Amino acid sequence: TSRRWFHPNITGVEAENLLLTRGVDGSFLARPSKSNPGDFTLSVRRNGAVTHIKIQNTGDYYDLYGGEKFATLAELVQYYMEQLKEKNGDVIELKYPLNCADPTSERWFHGHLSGKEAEKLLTEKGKHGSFLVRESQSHPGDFVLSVRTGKSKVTHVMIRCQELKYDVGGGERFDSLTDLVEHYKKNPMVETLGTVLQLKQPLNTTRINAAEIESRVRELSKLAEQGFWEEFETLQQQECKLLYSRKEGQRQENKNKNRYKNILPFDHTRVVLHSDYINANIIMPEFENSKPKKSYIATQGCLQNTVNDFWRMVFQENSRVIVMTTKEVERGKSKCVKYWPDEYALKEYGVMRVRNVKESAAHDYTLRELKLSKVGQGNTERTVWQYHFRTWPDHGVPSDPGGVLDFLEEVHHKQESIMDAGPVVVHCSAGIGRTGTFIVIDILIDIIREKGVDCDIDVPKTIQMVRSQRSGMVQTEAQYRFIYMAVQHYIETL
Ligand SMILES: N[C@@H]1c2ccccc2OC12CCN(c1cnc3c(N4CCCc5ncccc54)n[nH]c3n1)CC2
């Protein structure tokens, strides 16, 4: 499982040179789009030439130009390595990934961190095994590896840069900082007196106290003359660890139940309907109390032939709340089929019977009180509250988290008020972009709800934990910053 084919600091011209001199026909790489920030590019080599295929993402998915829509770049790349065609019909071959040697996106690489700033972090945040790599000041071009062991101590090892190859003063000589680190993780260094410098896990510098969210947002926003980009791209590199199987979704008899062909649900977290398939996953927050914990069901916008399966899941999971964060139509394109009856009306969706009891209209969202019951069974009725957010921009995210927070605050209070309420159903278009931003924002403030302003939160660690339960939760970096902005705003209104 690799993601080294993504080059975060390369230009289009630098990519053509890399592919023509250090690659062969079939070699490929991915990079951020420089002419159109927020987008990405897939540089592939063919018949001695290089092709640049664009990849756009406004918050819903990764749209490959002339290709398909994917939940993650790794999932996109894996899909084609096991037909991608130009818009002229020619077949593209993604054969040999061109590995990147830039360590910017590594969890343990901290750039120009100082030795004093490093020793401080390693002493107050680190445990046995915590390690990090920083740039050297007294020896420009070199790097410094600091490991903590323990009664406890911090050990500093120098990394020399000689002729574009790295070494720790002796032994083997590696082509990249990453190769050197992995080698000494599998084969840790040992001092003559017995001390083993075990590189267990990288020092955590993203966990913050909820109180200092504003000062942490200020830091991640500074100009080079941005930290958000470093924190985010370092998280995107970790997505190659989340390639769980999606067999049931790929089955022939389930293809037409997916809104997007390749955006499929994980097998180990998909909702099994007790004719068992639906593009949805259970999101159970896991972290390292007397109140029942809240779970979620991230799913896609209903298709005309999946509305019956949607209400079967809602009834089966005992869900009492539904969060819709998209219009039925956006930019003249269908994003979710109407799965609820007109106000005061009564419809039958297969064996399920739904009545739209009442609709309450605000500017940002509409609320519908639906009464769900199993046809032919009297003692099965229950109320289901559908919160339909309608003011989310077509592209990007809202400029202010105000409306979204008041929206989710009401959603939280309706759930808390219903005894034995099942998971909260949250859907969108593909159910990964906006649906991921809402669930992540809800999980993060629920932690603050129960522990207070003085508690520890880890935005990246939380997103990663949620991404292992549905492909590509939280799509873009704009939704990333918006998550920090939301947690920061919610804290300022207390
Ligand atoms: N390499 C970046 C960089 C470049 C230049 C200078 C400094 C600098 O620091 C870096 C490294 C440190 N830091 C982090 C650390 N961890 C993550 C992270 N994960 C992903 C899933 C596993 C995980 N588990 C627990 C916590 C976080 C995470 N996602 N984003 C992150 N960012 C900021 C960015």
UniProtKB/Swiss-Prot annotation:
It is found in: Cytoplasm; Nucleus. PROSITE patterns: SH2, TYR_PHOSPHATASE_1, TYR_PHOSPHATASE_2, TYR_PHOSPHATASE_PTP. Keywords: Acetylation, Cytoplasm, Deafness, Disease variant, Hydrolase, Nucleus, Phosphoprotein, Protein phosphatase, Repeat, SH2 domain. Its EC number is 3.1.3.48. Changing Y61D: In NS1; also in Noonan patients manifesting juvenile myelomonocytic leukemia. Changing F70K: In acute myeloid leukemia; requires 2 nucleotide substitutions. It is linked to LEOPARD syndrome 1: A disorder characterized by lentigines, electrocardiographic conduction abnormalities, ocular hypertelorism, pulmonic stenosis, abnormalities of genitalia, retardation of growth, and sensorineural deafness. Noonan syndrome 1: A form of Noonan syndrome, a disease characterized by short stature, facial dysmorphic features such as hypertelorism, a downward eyeslant and low-set posteriorly rotated ears, and a high incidence of congenital heart defects and hypertrophic cardiomyopathy. Other features can include a short neck with webbing or redundancy of skin, deafness, motor delay, variable intellectual deficits, multiple skeletal defects, cryptorchidism, and bleeding diathesis. This is Tyrosine-protein phosphatase non-receptor type 11. It comes from Homo sapiens.
